[PDB]
């Protein structure tokens, strides 16, 4: 279907000694494929998926050089931001940056993004036009004037509509055996008595990819949200995801309840009822 490539960057200042901790990760859809960790020994961008390992030395050298440059940019930024906000040198602070591009089913550019946060709050973001900036406060407004003067949006737009989508397409091709394969949820329902006349039904979806999924309960064919619990979608640890939704029912009435599962890997939604 549609696809995306995203990079996530986190820098955390360490006032007591040394430079900020810096961690960068890259994803294609819900698959991590590269990482850089300033605490790690290599000091290089590293592969995290088989299909990227085939990239040659020029790739790895280039990615390493660029991500290291990002790290230094964030280091300076932390200093600049501390001044903007008139903060002490004593406290730890965080800069986060995320950018990437989405393509449609035809692998053509759909949208691009680039946003930046200080201490967990919006700071500045490129608008969807890839020309304008959303600055959240007056410090960010100062940054926005700086970035206007430096043609920053022009460069990001060129990257997001060009290099970003071009290499995404390359990756989707090289990793097609997994990146373009959907893994439908393996589903089942469990039953747990809560008393001698009430029970929890739990509808499980396991080992699915991508992470996007919808689990809903119906009673007698109408959606029910009362007395339900839906956990956040969570990584299995093997590249797939898990989720469950549960409902408390009067014992003996289990057959009224149906769990409905929607996922890209399922031509038609699944319906589960208790055994």
């Amino acid at each position: 279907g549609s696809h995306s490539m995203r990079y996530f960057f986190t820098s955390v200042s360490r006032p007591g000694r040394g430079e900020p901790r810096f961690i960068a990760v890259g994803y294609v859809d819900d698959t991590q494929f590269v990482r850089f960790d300033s605490d790690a020994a290599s000091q290089r961008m590293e592969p995290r998926a088989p299909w990227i390992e085939q990239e040659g030395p020029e790739y790895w050298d280039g990615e390493t050089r660029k991500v290291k440059a990002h790290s230094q940019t964030h280091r300076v930024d932390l200093g600049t931001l501390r001044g903007y906000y008139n903060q002490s040198e004593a406290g730890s602070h965080t800069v986060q940056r995320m950018y990437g591009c989405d393509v449609g089913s035809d692998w053509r550019f759909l949208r691009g993004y680039h946003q930046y946060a200080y201490d967990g709050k919006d700071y500045i973001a490129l608008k969807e036009d890839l020309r304008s900036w959303t600055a959240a406060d007056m410090a960010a407004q100062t940054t926005k004037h700086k970035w206007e003067a430096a043609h920053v949006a022009e460069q990001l737009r060129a990257y997001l509509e060009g290099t970003c989508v071009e290499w995404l397409r390359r990756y989707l091709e090289n990793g097609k055996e997994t990146l373009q394969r959907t893994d439908a949820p393996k589903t089942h329902m469990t039953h747990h008595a809560v008393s001698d006349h009430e029970a929890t039904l739990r509808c499980w979806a396991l080992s699915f990819y991508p992470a996007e999924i919808t689990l809903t309960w119906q009673r007698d064919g109408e959606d029910q949200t009362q007395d339900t619990e839906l956990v956040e979608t969570r990584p299995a640890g093997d590249g797939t995801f898990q989720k469950w939704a549960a409902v408390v029912v009067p014992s003996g009435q289990e057959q009224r309840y149906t769990c409905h599962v929607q996922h890209e890997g399922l031509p038609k939604p699944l319906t589960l009822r208790w055994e």
Binding site: Y59, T80, I124, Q155
Partner: peptide, 9 residues
Amino acid sequence: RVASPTSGV
């Protein structure tokens, strides 16, 4: 492929 870094804030 990552982008080149932007100007500082």
